[PDB]
Amino acid sequence: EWQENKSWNAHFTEHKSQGVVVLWNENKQQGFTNNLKRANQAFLPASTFKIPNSLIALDLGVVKDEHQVFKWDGQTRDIATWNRDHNLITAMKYSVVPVYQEFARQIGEARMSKMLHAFDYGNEDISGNVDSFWLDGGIRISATEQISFLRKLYHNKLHVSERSQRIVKQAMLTEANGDYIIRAKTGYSTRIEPKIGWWVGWVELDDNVWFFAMNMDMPTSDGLGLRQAITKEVLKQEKIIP
Ligand SMILES: CS(=O)(=O)Nc1ccc(-c2cccc(C(=O)O)c2)cc1
């Protein structure tokens, strides 16, 4: 069921980094990773939490649809793309934390906790501040656990409406061409050691789906582009994308 392929480590070491890629072949129900241990180590989800957060916000009516505009609060932040109005699509695209912090406040601790348990999401522990627990609270999730959650979302099996799941998968759209579609979400965890980057999602092919979840050491923001680059090198090596 699970196979370890340490040859992928070359893709990390060549960039003087360390991390894990986890792949799941949906048709064959087989998983692949370069590091079985790290594949099952639990990290802060950081902005990958915008997937479950979006689902919950939509299903509870906190977010009406993917067109609703969340006005900039007028507080100048250091990420320029955050200092503007957003909808669900652009808020996902630019990882607009303050928009999702307000979602969490409106969801509230009780419903957030109840929903993460229904999702079987990570350690399901929202201890910490309701508007930041996915950044510096007690919640943790592994790369293999990200896959399990994403597979439920792909199949509309999470305990929210089909509509909520379709909208979030639309908002997860990252890349599409004649060969594949990638739906995914990046993450960047800095408040609790070790600092890491995430990229989780899936690759849709004509006749199969490959789920993926990777995290990697991220001592500075200079390496953030390696999250996608390393994942794609693994995908290319396994002949999943040209
Ligand atoms: C480059 S910089 O401007 O020096 N600092 C900086 C840049 C980007 C981010 C960020 C925030 C949320 C999510 C993500 C993500 O990639 O998923 C990235 C944080 C700090």
Residue written as token pair 């305990």: 159
136-142, long-range: CB < 8 A, 24+ apart: 136/44, 136/191, 136/192, 139/44, 139/45, 139/49, 140/42, 140/43, 140/44, 140/45, 141/42, 141/43, 141/45, 141/48, 142/39, 142/40, 142/41, 142/42, 142/43
DSSP H helices in 62-203: 88-93, 97-107, 109-118, 133-136, 143-154, 162-171
| CA-to-CA separations, 65 to 55, 61, 170, 184, in angstroms, rounded | 11, 9, 11, 19
- Using a 10 angstrom Cβ sphere, with 0-12 exposed, 13-18 middle and 19 or more buried, the burial of residue 40 is middle
Residue 148 catalytic? no
Q: In what order do the strands lie in the sheet with 2-4?
A: 2-4, 30-33, 19-25, 209-217, 196-204, 181-189, 173-176
104-111, long-range: CB < 8 A, 24+ apart: 104/53, 104/130, 104/131, 104/133, 105/130, 105/131, 106/57, 106/62, 107/53, 107/56, 107/57, 107/60, 107/62, 111/56, 111/60
Give the separation between CA 187 and CA 58, rounded to whole angstroms: 21
Mutate to test the pocket of ligand 1, among 188, 196, 198, 215 (most ligand atoms within 8 A of CB): 188
Contact call for residues 31 and 62 (beta carbons, < 8 A) = no
- Domain locations in the chain as residue ranges: 1-242
**Is 54 flagged in the annotation as binding?**
no
**Is 189 flagged in the annotation as binding?**
no
Mutate to test the pocket of ligand 1, among 43, 50, 79 (most ligand atoms within 8 A of CB): 79
208-230 in b/e form (b: 16+ CB < 10 A) is ebbbbbbbbebeeeebeebbbeb
Query: Which ligand 1 atom is nearest residue 198's CA?
Result: 17
Give the separation between CA 179 and CA 200, rounded to whole angstroms: 19
CATH architecture of 1-242: 3-Layer(aba) Sandwich (3.40)
Q: What is the rounded end-to-end Cα distance, in angstroms, of the chain?
A: 25
Query: For residue 221, how far is its CA from the centre of ligand 1 (angstroms)?
Result: 7
Contact call for residues 35 and 142 (beta carbons, < 8 A) = no
Give the separation between CA 74 and CA 61, rounded to whole angstroms: 24
